[PDB]
């Protein structure tokens, strides 16, 4: 008959933004899982080995632009 | 010539309002210019179709409360299958003034039966005056055959109608038949 040379696929990795704008986060809380820097680390946000953006401090998450880059900041809580 | 159209204020906007107007057998139009805010009006469908039969006519819009004012139909959205006018963009003109418009190219020349004249454009942007709008721009290719081509910088344009488009591209072509 016939057969397919396809049928392989990788497991779902579950990327994407995990905390949206204004959401209160704790220090170290993961903000976005991603491959490559679609979002760059902004103020109060660190970037991990697999390009995960996480919170360096408590506060509220905001998405903005720092110079020419899309960045994610954590504004310290009032 | 001046074509007079009666219009009244349009205040309901959106697809529902436009559908209701077209079912009422009118046509929406927006009339804008370089001096005043856009005016949203509705026109009679039959009168609009009759006026827009010709290309680049000079319309006078009369609103009962307002005064008649002179415009040109710059963008006419017509139905594709049916010929109905779906929407009109009216651009206001200041009587004594100048305008940029498109005039239709046509062939009125005859060559040897081997070669047939062809038009490389439907319309050409020609800067003319309001009161003398060229209905058609005519180019005659008679006695010319082979592979001669005509660009946009050599036309028998009527007086007062300067060329605004590029003059470094071809407009008319005569070449052997579809061999």
């Amino acid at each position: 008959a016939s057969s397919s040379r396809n049928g392989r696929d990788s497991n779902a990795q579950r990327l994407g933004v995990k905390r949206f704008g204004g959401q209160l986060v704790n220090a170290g809380e993961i903000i976005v899982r991603q491959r490559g820097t679609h979002f760059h680390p902004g103020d109060g946000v660190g970037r991990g080995g697999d390009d995960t953006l996480f919170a360096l401090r408590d506060g509220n998450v905001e998405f903005g632009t720092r110079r020419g880059r899309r960045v994610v900041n954590v504004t310290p809580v009032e | 010539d001046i074509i007079h159209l009666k219009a009244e204020q349009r205040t309901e906007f959106g697809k529902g309002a436009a559908r209701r107007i077209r079912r009422d057998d009118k046509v929406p139009a927006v009339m804008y210019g370089h001096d005043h805010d856009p005016i949203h009006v509705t026109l009679d469908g039959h009168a609009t179709l009759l006026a827009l039969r010709t290309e680049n006519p000079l319309l006078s819009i009369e609103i009962e409360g307002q005064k008649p004012m002179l415009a040109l139909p710059k963008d006419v959205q017509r139905d594709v299958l049916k010929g109905f006018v779906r929407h009109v963009d009216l651009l206001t003109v200041r009587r004594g003034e100048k305008v940029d418009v498109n005039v239709a190219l046509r062939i009125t020349g005859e060559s040897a039966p081997g070669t047939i004249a062809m038009t490389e454009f439907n319309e050409i942007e020609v800067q003319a005056d309001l009161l003398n709008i060229p209905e058609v721009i005519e180019i005659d290719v008679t006695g010319l055959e082979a592979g001669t081509t005509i660009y946009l910088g050599d036309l028998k344009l009527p007086e007062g109608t300067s060329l605004l488009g590029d003059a470094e591209d071809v407009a008319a072509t005569v070449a052997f038949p579809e061999t």
Binding site: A1, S2, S3, S4, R5, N6 | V80, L81, A104, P113, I116, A117, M118, T119, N122, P177, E178, T179
Partner: protein, 136 residues
């Protein structure tokens, strides 16, 4: 028969056949033309039949433009076989026609014989179509 030299992917999903014509609803090259009033798939064999009809009727004069191109491949399941075992091999090449699309254009021919040639062509197409002109 119009067949593309190559395509990125030979096995593709069926083209969307919803909506009106995305573009190319107006004459761009010729004086007269065929405008499809209904959507559908237009195979290269149908395109060739219509083009042959138009050219043969207009004889030597005038020129014909084929506005659409059958660049979408259609696979066929292997004959007499149960469902499954992957997608088939491309067997047909079609163009995605939507209402208002200008299919063929003609120039350099008087209007009456142009109309007759367009009628000959239209009787070969699988969807309803009409003769259009630049208002003469």
């Amino acid at each position: 028969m119009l067949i593309p030299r190559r395509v990125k992917y030979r096995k593709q999903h069926h083209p969307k056949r919803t909506g009106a014509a995305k573009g190319g609803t107006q004459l761009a090259f010729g004086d007269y033309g065929i405008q499809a009033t209904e959507g559908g798939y237009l195979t290269n064999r149908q395109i060739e039949a219509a083009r042959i009809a138009m050219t043969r009727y207009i004889k030597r004069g005038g020129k014909v433009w084929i506005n659409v191109y059958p660049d979408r491949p259609m696979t066929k399941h292997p004959a007499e076989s149960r469902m499954g075992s992957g997608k088939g091999t491309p067997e047909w090449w079609i163009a995605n026609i939507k209402p208002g699309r200008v299919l063929f254009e003609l120039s350099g021919v008087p209007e009456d014989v142009a109309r007759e040639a367009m009628r000959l062509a239209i009787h070969k197409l699988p969807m309803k179509a009409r003769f259009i002109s630049r208002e003469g």
